[PDB]
Structure formats: C-alpha cells, structure tokens
Ligand binder design. Structure first.
Ligand code: HEM
Ligand SMILES: [Ca+2]
Ligand SMILES: [Ca+2]
Length: 87
C-alpha cells in the first residue's frame, strides 16, 4: 500500500507552490517545511524535484531531525526509477 510517484512526476514539484524531494527512495513534501528548516530554505529549494539523499547524510542530521522528516513522507519513488536514483 506504498503510494508511488515517478521521477518524471517528482521533477514537477520544484517550486514555491509544491516542493518535493527524494531521500532513500521515499518522497517528502517540504513545501511548508522549508519555511522552518534550521538549515535554511535555499538548500532545500536547490534539491527540489530530485534526490537529496547524499546531502541529507552528509550534513549529519540528528536522530531528532530524521524523526521529524518522517512526518513529510507522501509516498515512495516508483520502482521503475530505482536504478536511476539509488537508495
Ligand atoms: C525532511 C528532511 C529534513 C529535515 C526534517 C531537516 C531537519 C533539520 C533540522 C531539525 C536541523 C537542525 C540540526 C539537526 O537536527 O541535525 C537541520 C539542519 C540542517 N539541514 Fe536539514 N533537514 C532536512 C533535510 C535537509 C536536506 C535535504 C539538506 C540539504 C540539502 C539539509 C541541510 C541542512 C543544513 C545545512 C543544516 C544546518 C547545519 C546543521 O545543523 O548541521 N537538510 N535540518
Ligand atoms: Ca521562516
Ligand atoms: Ca520563505
């Protein structure tokens, strides 16, 4: 009962009205969060419409931040795109 979104669809959610990104094959709707994110808005905007897995780990996000991230999950990357995008 995973909801899947294609990469082609996710790429459209790249603006102030709808900003999504991908972390570890899951899709996060950060449209509203980016106004609250402690790391600022632009790092998230930069990533909108695509995968940001590497950026998210490289920062060293706290466990608290991971836990918070789960609240923004709206679905997962379609299986057809899971060799293009890794996990
Ligand atoms: C839904 C996903 C995300 C959530 C919930 C989130 C949450 C947070 C929170 C709560 C902090 C404060 C420090 C901490 O708790 O570790 C933080 C800091 C930061 N975040 Fe995120 N973040 C997310 C995604 C990202 C992404 C994808 C990037 C980069 C593209 C990013 C870049 C940063 C930076 C640069 C800081 C500031 C430096 C630091 O505190 O280490 N964040 N984030
Ligand atoms: Ca703000
Ligand atoms: Ca703003």
């Amino acid at each position: 009962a995973v909801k899947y979104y294609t990469l082609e669809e996710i790429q459209k959610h790249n603006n102030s009205k709808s900003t999504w990104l991908i972390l570890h094959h899951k899709v996060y709707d950060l449209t509203k969060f980016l106004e609250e994110h402690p790391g600022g808005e632009e790092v998230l905007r930069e990533q909108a419409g695509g995968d940001a897995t590497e950026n998210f780990e490289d920062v060293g996000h706290s466990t608290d931040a991971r836990e918070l991230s789960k609240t923004f999950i709206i679905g997962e990357l379609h299986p057809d795109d899971r060799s293009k995008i890794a996990k």
